[PDB]
C-alpha cells in the first residue's frame, strides 16, 4: 500500500482482516520469547506494536493509504485490551450487527452504535450535521419507546411520537441499500448514492415532505427520486 502511495502517486485503501489477530500473535510471540505477560495476557509492547503498524497508515503529500480494519471483539467485551487499544487509533466505526439483519435490512449497519469523528460541522458542513443529528435523535427516540410499544401499543403514543416512530421506521428502512455486487444473488439491480443526494433526501423525509408515502417505498431504493417512482409503481400494481 505504501509503495502505491509513495511510488505510484495515488490514493489506495488497505483492508486488514482481522486486526485482533495481530495482537493475538504479538502475545504469542512475547510469551514464547519469555517476556512477562501483562494484563489478561497481552504483550507489554501492545500499544507500541499497534502504533508502529497504524501510524504508517496516514496521509502524505504523495497520497493517502486508507484502512478498513475488521475488529474481532472477544466475548463482546469492548474493554478487552485488544479492541481497547485498537479504538485509540481508528476514528470511524462501522458496526454490522445481527440485530439489524434479524429484521431484514442490508447493509445491516447499526445507525446508532456506528459513529465517526468526522461528523463535525467544520468537516461535513452544518447542513449535514443537522440532518445526521436529527436522524440519531429520531432513531434513538424510537429505540426508547420500544418497551412502551410492546407492553402497550402504538395507540397510546402521542400524535407526536407516533409521527416520530413512523419517520423512524421510514428512515431505518431508507438506510438500506442494494449493492452493485448483490445483483447476482438478490437480483436487485444495485445502486450508489452521492452525499448530496443522501443528505437532501433525508432532509426531505425529516421535513415531512414525503410522509404521505408508505414505508416499503424506502426499502431498497437509492434516493428519494426513486422512492417516489417505487411508490407509484406499487400503488399501480
Amino acid at each position: 500500500a505504501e509503495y502505491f502511495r509513495d511510488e505510484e502517486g495515488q490514493d489506495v485503501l488497505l483492508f486488514i482482516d482481522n486486526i485482533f489477530r495481530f495482537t493475538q500473535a504479538g502475545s504469542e510471540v512475547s510469551a514464547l520469547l519469555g517476556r512477562i505477560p501483562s494484563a489478561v495476557g497481552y504483550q507489554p509492547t501492545l500499544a507500541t506494536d499497534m502504533g508502529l503498524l497504524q501510524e504508517r497508515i496516514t496521509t502524505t503529500k504523495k497520497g493517502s493509504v486508507t484502512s478498513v480494519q475488521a475488529v474481532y471483539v472477544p466475548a463482546d467485551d469492548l474493554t478487552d485490551p485488544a479492541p481497547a487499544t485498537t479504538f485509540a487509533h481508528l476514528d470511524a466505526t462501522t458496526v454490522l450487527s445481527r440485530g439489524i439483519s434479524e429484521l431484514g435490512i442490508y447493509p445491516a449497519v447499526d445507525p446508532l452504535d456506528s459513529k465517526s469523528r468526522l461528523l463535525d460541522a467544520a468537516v461535513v458542513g452544518q447542513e449535514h450535521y443537522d440532518v445526521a443529528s436529527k436522524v440519531q435523535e429520531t432513531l434513538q427516540t424510537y429505540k426508547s419507546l420500544q418497551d412502551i410499544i410492546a407492553i402497550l401499543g402504538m395507540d397510546e403514543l402521542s400524535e407526536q411520537d407516533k409521527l416520530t416512530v413512523e419517520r423512524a421506521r421510514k428512515i431505518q428502512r431508507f438506510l438500506s441499500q442494494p449493492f452493485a455486487v448483490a445483483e447476482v444473488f438478490t437480483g436487485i439491480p444495485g445502486k450508489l448514492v452521492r452525499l448530496k443526494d443522501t443528505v437532501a433526501s433525508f432532509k426531505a423525509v425529516l421535513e415531512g415532505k414525503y410522509d404521505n408515502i408508505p414505508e416499503h417505498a424506502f426499502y431498497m431504493v437509492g434516493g428519494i427520486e426513486d422512492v417516489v417512482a417505487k411508490a407509484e409503481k406499487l400503488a399501480a400494481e
Binding site: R35, I36, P37, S38, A47
Partner: peptide, 22 residues
C-alpha cells in the same frame, strides 16, 4: 493512562516485579 502503560512496558521488559493490573 498511556504514560502508565508505557511505564508498565518499560518495567516489565526490565523484568521488574509487577503488581496489580500488571
Amino acid at each position: 493512562s498511556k504514560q502508565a502503560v508505557a511505564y508498565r512496558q518499560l518495567s516489565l521488559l526490565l523484568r521488574r516485579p509487577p503488581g496489580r493490573e500488571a
